[PDB]
Amino acid sequence: GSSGSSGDETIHLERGENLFEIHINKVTFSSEVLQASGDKEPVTFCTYAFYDFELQTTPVVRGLHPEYNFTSQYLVHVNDLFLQYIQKNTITLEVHQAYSTEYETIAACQLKFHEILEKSGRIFCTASLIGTKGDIPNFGTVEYWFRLRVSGPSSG
């Protein structure tokens, strides 16, 4: 076969299994967070749960702009209850700082996909981060992408 730059437009996918994968590139910070850090490779980690499944802990890494390079996927069968869920409730991914002594949260955002409501697939999107205490509206932006298509097996 072949692959490359392409597009897809559809409302409801065919009758088959659906695989929801989520690959997080990395997490950028703002001039404020960069300095606020402490001139020391800041270590943080994110977490989230889909379809009320087992929560997954992101890979801890030191640095300013690490590459989690984490790719999670699970074969889930659901369409109607799927879209409704996206609305009824969204995903909450907070970013807490993991210290070598204690652990506390300093940021919290709401992960939700709008396009998924109409379209389905590689829909580029982003989310903003806000500081809980510091109250920093320019904490940083997260780079992620979602996809929902028939993960049914094929002959080939």
Side-chain angles (χ1 to χ4, degrees), residues 130-156:
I130 290 87
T132 59
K133 316 156 271 83
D135 313 313
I136 303 164
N138 298 29
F139 205 72
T141 319
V142 64
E143 275 192 60
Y144 67 70
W145 61 274
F146 56 108
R147 86 90 62 159
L148 168 63
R149 195 165 170 78
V150 58
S151 203
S154 281
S155 289

Side-chain angles (χ1 to χ4, degrees), residues 1-133:
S2 194
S3 275
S5 181
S6 291
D8 200 314
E9 289 176 272
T10 194
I11 308 301
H12 174 231
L13 275 295
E14 68 192 81
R15 294 288 286 171
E17 300 319 289
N18 289 323
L19 185 90
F20 203 92
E21 327 160 303
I22 303 167
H23 171 8
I24 306 285
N25 198 341
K26 67 273 171 153
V27 172
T28 315
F29 293 137
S30 210
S31 63
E32 171 77 56
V33 158
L34 300 175
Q35 274 291 306
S37 157
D39 272 339
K40 295 210 292 293
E41 299 152 276
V43 201
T44 78
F45 64 97
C46 26
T47 67
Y48 64 68
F50 175 89
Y51 210 59
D52 208 36
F53 271 128
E54 67 182 82
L55 200 91
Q56 210 90 96
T57 296
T58 55
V60 186
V61 187
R62 311 90 159 76
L64 269 294
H65 329 246
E67 297 185 61
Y68 304 108
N69 275 32
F70 177 63
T71 312
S72 150
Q73 55 150 71
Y74 28 78
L75 191 296
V76 308
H77 72 116
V78 57
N79 291 240
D80 199 52
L81 278 169
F82 197 122
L83 290 175
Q84 274 53 93
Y85 162 104
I86 301 279
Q87 288 287 113
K88 285 192 81 182
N89 65 120
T90 62
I91 296 90
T92 304
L93 175 149
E94 305 150 300
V95 174
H96 30 248
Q97 207 150 71
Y99 322 120
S100 65
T101 39
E102 202 150 309
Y103 316 74
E104 203 167 70
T105 329
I106 73 284
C109 51
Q110 303 310 93
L111 281 196
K112 77 185 85 89
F113 323 99
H114 300 54
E115 297 78 274
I116 205 166
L117 293 152
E118 312 209 274
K119 309 150 150 151
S120 315
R122 175 173 208 163
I123 307 151
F124 315 89
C125 208
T126 47
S128 59
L129 283 156
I130 290 87
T132 59
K133 316 156 271 83

